[PDB]
Amino acid sequence: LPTPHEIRNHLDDYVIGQEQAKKVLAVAVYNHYKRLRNGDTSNGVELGKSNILLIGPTGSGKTLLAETLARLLDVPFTMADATTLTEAGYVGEDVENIIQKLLQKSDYDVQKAQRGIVYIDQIDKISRKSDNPRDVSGEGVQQALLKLIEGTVAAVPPQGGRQQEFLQVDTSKILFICGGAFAGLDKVISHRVETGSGIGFGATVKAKSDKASEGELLAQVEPEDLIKFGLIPEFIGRLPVVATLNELSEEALIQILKEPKNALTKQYQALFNLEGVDLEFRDEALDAIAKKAMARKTGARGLRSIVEAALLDTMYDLPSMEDVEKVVIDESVIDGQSEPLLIY
Amino acid sequence: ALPTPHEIRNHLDDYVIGQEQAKKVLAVAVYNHYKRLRNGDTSNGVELGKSNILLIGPTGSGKTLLAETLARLLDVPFTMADATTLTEAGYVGEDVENIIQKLLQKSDYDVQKAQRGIVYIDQIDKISRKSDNPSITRDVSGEGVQQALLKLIEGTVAAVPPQGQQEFLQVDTSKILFICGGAFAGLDKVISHRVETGSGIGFGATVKAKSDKASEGELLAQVEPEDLIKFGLIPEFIGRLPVVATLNELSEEALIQILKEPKNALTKQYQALFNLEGVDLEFRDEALDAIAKKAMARKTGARGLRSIVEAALLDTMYDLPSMEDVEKVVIDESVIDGQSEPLLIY
């Protein structure tokens, strides 16, 4: 049933700018389900576990891929958070609660829940930082999660009980997608491999050029680098598949403002349409916006700041203004040097 | 109908002065919020976006005043929370969810009426890391609460105790506004590092300070999201707040206007205090400007102005009750210096 060719096209409809990442997920997703079709029946013994490790910058679409995949996929999907997770459940939460929410989506169907997908956001949150210690969000969380990720049956009261019984739902079959933004990881990889600082005439020095630090550096990531970050090596050993996402290109940004149905121009113009005046954006403004956005280095999430701040003056006085049929925005408006000219 | 940006700003002008740049920002959000709440999830463009404001300004610039005045004219519910007590990872003290439970007291347990509410936070700068990207000891209000808040702004549902069965309710935050703003301390040093680019020793090294450069207002205006990363904020948290408002330091003229034009101007408050005693209080124009000059030297903002007035009239306030048959009291510019005593009218 799974198709790697079609799934890549489907993700392209909702995600843009990450072509390599789509290929990685299609292989792991196809392999994981194919394994369950014939479980441990092949001649090959000790088959490696198929897991996913999403790693990319902010606004790269980590949370977006989990949403799009859930809609396209038939099995139930869940969206949890690592910040809420706590060890030995004092007042925050428990690891077993993740399984309870999965059944609510699957309507207490063990046969249908074991084939489900799991996605945990902000994986970096559980990084073990116990230099000055007890720790409820550090080693305790990762230790409990590793036990679950290893594959074990955990007691879960079905429906809560009206019984003193619990179901032994398997865990090795269920898939897991550990993803989150890694801050400081680039420095760790750069610290290990620099291959520079040559003072000789023959030697070369690169101060601004960083050999595509946003994308190339991620491609050369190793498990040993994450160990210094705080993660446990056994946790990384269980995830042979890692996804690397490069920084969005200026071309990709333009596509994100036009092709998607959640585009800023579409919603903002729709909002202006309610007022009664149409909104027009030229192509020259779009490429200009992309350059400013990349400078901020905030991702797509910070794109809105440039568009809104530029239109702050226009929206403030637009209701008072009358007899304006359409609004025209030029490239200079993005810079802010020239005010936009209205159409009557 | 809904209020217009010009109409709401005319109301804010009575309580706020010299912050034109900030009044327009709050006006568009309120206008956008009502427009978002005007249509019943029906629009030409689906998935209407949410914009979060980040109020940044000097000390005593009027940030806390705007959130208070906004709730008076705002019809929808409003809450005034604080980031001081936020406890990430469920430690002792208040939790992020509390902000939502507090929003029901003003809304009187109305979920449909609560999702259309506005939220304001203060002292958001205080929860930033100490100019270090990696946290060594898992800061509860550093690398903690900042992350915890991400889920709420992004849009999720959190269980809240209905009363003080014991079942909980779910309320989404995807269509709830949040105004997180606080006076950042030491931000000027970071901005100077990235924009002055003239440090060093030499004939051709541009080094001119304490006279022209290092202006508080100019530095804040040139702020960018990349600058906050060196300060301690996480980029994820900054991504959820695209809008940014840069307030300025109160000018000498602004102080004079704030002394008389506001409804609750300090000059009027003291007159009310003196009015009940039975003695009128008048301030001569010349005297008012002198007080403004002293306030700027203190570098404490509008709040510091009370100190100057209190000291100037400290002696008169002590002797006014024991004195009798006094109709009017006039304060002169010399009285502010303290060399002379204000005249009295019998």
């Binding site: - | 440090s199 060093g200 020793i201 004939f203 090294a205 080094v207 001119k208 300070a209 304490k210």
Partner: protein, 192 residues
């Protein structure tokens, strides 16, 4: 030998040399003949103090019998380029170039000791070679003499004709006469 001193600080004790200790307080010493090496060291000191604090006055103590002219003109332009007021003081003696840097200090911040002495004369030189080369070097040194008199009048306030007549030969001026001549502002007899 140079003695070593100890500066008490909040962090801890630090051993500094006498010359370096005073440099921290915006104090520079001009000793011996004026040459290219000693002059290049003072220029770095002035620039270093400018960056540390551009609003604090600098103090320059001069005790030297003079020297090369080109080495001294670098110090004059440096004092005027930097915003801080370079205070000058005369200790022991002030020769042709030593006197020019003394009077070049900030107006109102120039002092002379009660027993100090200033000497001023015309530039010295010489050359050996063809007659054509002597004319070239003679016109050059004449330009310097004219240039040095113009600047001397600017700071001292006297007329250009008076400085020329007074600098034709060696002219010694006591500390009181220097005040009347506009070369200095006052005398630092005692501490107040």
């Amino acid at each position: 030998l140079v003695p070593m001193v100890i500066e008490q600080t909040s962090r801890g004790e630090r051993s500094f040399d006498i010359y370096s200790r005073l440099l921290k307080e915006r104090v520079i010493f001009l000793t011996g003949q004026v040459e290219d090496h000693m002059a290049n060291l003072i220029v770095a000191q002035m620039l270093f103090l400018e960056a540390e604090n551009p609003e604090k006055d600098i103090y320059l103590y001069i005790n030297s019998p003079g020297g090369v002219i080109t080495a001294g003109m670098s110090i004059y332009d440096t004092m005027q380029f930097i915003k801080p007021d370079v205070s000058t003081i005369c200790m022991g003696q002030a020769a042709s170039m030593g006197a020019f840097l003394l009077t070049a200090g900030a107006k109102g911040k120039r002092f002379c000791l009660p027993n100090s002495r200033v000497m001023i004369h015309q530039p010295l030189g010489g050359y050996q070679g063809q007659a054509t080369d002597i004319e070239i070097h003679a016109r050059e040194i004449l330009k310097v003499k004219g240039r040095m008199n113009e600047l001397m009048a600017l700071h001292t306030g006297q007329s250009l004709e008076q400085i020329e007549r007074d600098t034709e030969r060696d002219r010694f001026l006591s500390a009181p006469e220097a005040v009347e001549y506009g070369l200095v502002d006052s005398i630092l007899t005692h501490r107040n």
